[PDB]
Design a protein around this ligand. Structure first.
Ligand SMILES: [Cl-]
Ligand code: NA
Ligand code: NA
Lengths: 134, 155, 161, 134
């Protein structure tokens, strides 16, 4: 599973997610990656999110949109919303994984509850950071 | 102001099984793709084109379980899925269960921009793509020895 | 609060002008029988999950409603059926999209939920999973009705106009 | 499209949605009906929602889950949430249709912005109500 979120110089947010799914997958299974609000969501009023982990749980908790809803309706910070969803609600359902999120203010979060998440980020005209482990 | 984050998946990663030479390969790929994305954003490209290109590169990179280097299903096939969403319009495109398209994220983007639909699945998604001029690929192009060995291990 | 059921058979351009009381009464009697089935089940202590499963199974079975038997037709004069079921207790969910050979998509969706580790299955993959679990394979023409075919012929005529 | 929502004697909420899609549909197209949080959603702590309408807008707006989030995070009543989603947001986005919803307090709502929605509801051991038009 791979993903990208971006805030551009004009204040627009976008997200994308792509996957081959899981090793030994039952043919016909669909995880969170292609489902709007589960594995992918973007809204200029809130946040761009791409998810990765136990796809069944990201669907049942609508992880991507839940970040957006907590911020939009709840008034939570990007950091509060990410902590709630990734660190509390997903594990409560037996979910593991993480996501990348950029809010309308260009705040960035890359939460995960797993041992690893292949990830990288950087501000435009600035030096990028990569990451594997915590 | 402008900023990009990317990921190549969570949960698949264990220090005790990784070599440092594998870690470096991943750091290089992640760093090269986020940089492509940064240059695009500095040059005034849209968030939509930027996330599209970033995910296209992650698809093309055999290190990542998307497009080339996709995991295998129980039937030793590849079934690919992708979504893209524009925060300005709430417009979104998505394909699920595609086998004969090289870049799912570009198929998802074709559904968004060249259909009234959000989500297309299976042969119908592929026929829609082909009709709009997207190339049909043989499904073996995504197959990698590393992923195939992981399938045999899982059994 | 009090146990309760709501059902729908779809929102859209339902034109009082066009309809006769006699046509309307076919819809009202179908809706009334189905909701009464669900109320009876709720009164007997049946689960919300089994009540919504059964109400939607009956709406599928009823040719008046665009689900299972009486499904609208694709551009290709085929039927592609989709369904979802979700349990507010466990937050488990089951869903199928683009199935043509399963009589009751809501029962396949429930089967995904109960007899797989998964939430969503599509296409032939969904059909093979349900067959393997012992759900029957049907001919795609069992859903076909004259009223929906005539609606496809009218949409085609409009398109050329 | 068709759907049911229920609150049982034990306080469980559930929701189911089924469809044949739309007349003259492009083969492979998927509407809100089978998508958790779009055409179908149920959570004991909030609501059971089944939707019907312009599938692309109910996906993009995550109509079913949005009802849940508006109530839980926004503190809206079921009636306020249904008005917001069905009578304001979905029409602004260019969508039409309706939904059925039961909250954890046994309130029931059958909003729609179309001419008709085929519908019925009834409390256990009470007389049912049926309806077609506004
Ligand atoms: Cl009426
Ligand atoms: Na790849
Ligand atoms: Na029917």
């Amino acid at each position: 599973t791979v993903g990208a979120v971006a805030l551009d110089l004009d204040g627009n947010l976008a997200a994308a997610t792509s996957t081959g799914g899981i090793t030994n997958k039952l043919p016909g299974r669909v995880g969170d990656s292609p489902l709007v609000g589960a594995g992918c969501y973007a809204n200029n009023a809130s946040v761009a999110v791409s998810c990765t982990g136990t796809g069944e749980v990201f669907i049942r908790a609508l992880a991507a949109y839940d970040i957006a809803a907590l911020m939009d309706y709840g008034g939570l910070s990007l950091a509060e919303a990410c902590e709630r969803v990734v660190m509390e609600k997903l594990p409560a359902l037996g979910g593991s994984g993480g996501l990348i999120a950029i809010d309308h203010e260009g705040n960035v979060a890359l939460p995960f509850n797993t041992e690893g998440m292949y990830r990288a980020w950087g501000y435009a005209g600035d030096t990028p950071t990569t990451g594997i482990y915590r | 102001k402008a900023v990009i984050a990317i990921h190549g998946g969570a949960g698949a990663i264990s220090r005790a099984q990784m070599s440092l030479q594998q870690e470096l390969r991943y750091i290089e790929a992640l760093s090269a793709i986020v940089e492509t994305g940064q240059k695009m954003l500095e040059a005034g490209e849209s968030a939509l084109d930027v996330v599209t290109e970033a995910v296209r590169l992650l698809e093309e990179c055999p290190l990542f379980n998307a497009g080339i280097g996709a995991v295998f299903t129980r039937d030793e096939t590849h079934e690919l899925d992708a979504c893209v969403m524009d925060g300005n319009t709430l417009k979104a495109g998505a394909v699920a269960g595609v086998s004969h398209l090289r870049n799912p994220v570009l198929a998802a983007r074709l559904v968004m921009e060249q259909s009234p639909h959000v989500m297309m699945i299976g042969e119908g998604a592929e026929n829609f793509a082909f009709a709009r001029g997207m190339e049909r690929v043989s499904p073996e192009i995504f197959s990698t020895s590393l992923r195939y060995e992981q399938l045999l291990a899982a059994r």
